[PDB]
C-alpha cells in the first residue's frame, strides 16, 4: 500500500501575552505518532502512538532537540514576515509548515513535500522536482533568493528522498500492527421517516482504516451527487474513521437506491440497497 510520513507545524504570535505558540505534530499515514507543544510542561517531544514509545532516550532527546530548534526558527519567521508584509506589532499571525514523504507499495520514494503558509495562504513551497521553489509574491521571493543562495533545497532533497523514507519504513516495520493494517468498513443503512411521503436513507461506513473511502448514492444507476448529504470523514477516536451519506427518498421508491462503498479493504465495492 502507498504510505506517507508528514510533519505539521504551527507558530501563532501572542503580541503582548508572550512568546508565540508552537505546536508540532507528526503522522505516518492517518496515525499521529508524536507531538511537541510550546505551552506544555515538559518541553520534550512526546509519543502519541504506543509503537513509538519504546524508541530510545536517544530518539526522544534527539527529536526534542530538533523540534526545539524548529520552534525557535519559526518564532524568528513570525517577526520577519510581519516586516515583509509591513504589519503592526500588535496583531496575532500564523506560520504553518508541513513537510514529509510518500513511498509506493514497494516502499521506495514517490514524492517529497516542503511548504509554508503565512495566515492560511501559501507562502513558499519546494516544487515536486525538489529542486525549485514556488514563491508566491515579493516577500516569498526574498525568501526564495535566500534559500537559493544557501542551497537549502539540495539539503532538503536529501532528507525527503533519504532519511524521511528510511524513517517511514522503520516506523512501518516497528508499528506494523497499527500502521500496516487495513480496517475495512462496517456498513449498514438506516431509514427515518421525515414525513408521510418522505424518508431519509443513511448509508454508514464505520471502523475503517485508512481514512480513504468513496460512499456514493445512486437512483436507477444515476449518480446522486447533488442530492446526497455527505459528511466529512471523521475520526472515531480509536484510530478508525466514520462516514455517512444520506438521501431523502420519495415514499415507495426505496428500491431505486443503491449506496456504493469503495475502500482499500473491500475485495470488491459494496452496493447496498434498502430491502
Amino acid at each position: 500500500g502507498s504510505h506517507s510520513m508528514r510533519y505539521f507545524f504551527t507558530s501563532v504570535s501572542r503580541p503582548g501575552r508572550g512568546e508565540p505558540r508552537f505546536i508540532a505534530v507528526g503522522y505516518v499515514d492517518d496515525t499521529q505518532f508524536v507531538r511537541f507543544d510550546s505551552d506544555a510542561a515538559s518541553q520534550r517531544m512526546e509519543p502519541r502512538a504506543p509503537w513509538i514509545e519504546q524508541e530510545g532516550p536517544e530518539y526522544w532527546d534527539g527529536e526534542t532537540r530538533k523540534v526545539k530548534a524548529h520552534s525557535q526558527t519559526h518564532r524568528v519567521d513570525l517577526g520577519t514576515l510581519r516586516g515583509y508584509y509591513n504589519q503592526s506589532e500588535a496583531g496575532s499571525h500564523t506560520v504553518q509548515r508541513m513537510y514529509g514523504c510518500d513511498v509506493g507499495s514497494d516502499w521506495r520514494f514517490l514524492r517529497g513535500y516542503h511548504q509554508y503558509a503565512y495566515d492560511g495562504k501559501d507562502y513558499i513551497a519546494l516544487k515536486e522536482d525538489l529542486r525549485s521553489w514556488t514563491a508566491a509574491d515579493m516577500a516569498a521571493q526574498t525568501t526564495k533568493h535566500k534559500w537559493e543562495a544557501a542551497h537549502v533545497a539540495e539539503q532538503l532533497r536529501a532528507y525527503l528522498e533519504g532519511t524521511c523514507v528510511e524513517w517511514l519504513r522503520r516506523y512501518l516495520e516497528n508499528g506494523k500492527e497499527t500502521l500496516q493494517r487495513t480496517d475495512a468498513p462496517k456498513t449498514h443503512m438506516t431509514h427515518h421517516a421525515v414525513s408521510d411521503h418522505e424518508a431519509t436513507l443513511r448509508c454508514w461506513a464505520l471502523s475503517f482504516y485508512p481514512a480513504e473511502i468513496t460512499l456514493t448514492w445512486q437512483r436507477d444507476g444515476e449518480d446522486q451527487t447533488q442530492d446526497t448529504e455527505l459528511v466529512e470523514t471523521r475520526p472515531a477516536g480509536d484510530g478508525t474513521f466514520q462516514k455517512w451519506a444520506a438521501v431523502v427518498v420519495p415514499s415507495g421508491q426505496e428500491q431505486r437506491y443503491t449506496c456504493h462503498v469503495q475502500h482499500e479493504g473491500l475485495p470488491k465495492p459494496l452496493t447496498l440497497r434498502w430491502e
Partner: peptide, 9 residues
C-alpha cells in the same frame, strides 16, 4: 524523525 537542520524565511 524530523529534519536535522533549520533555516529561516
Amino acid at each position: 524523525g524530523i529534519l536535522g537542520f533549520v533555516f529561516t524565511l
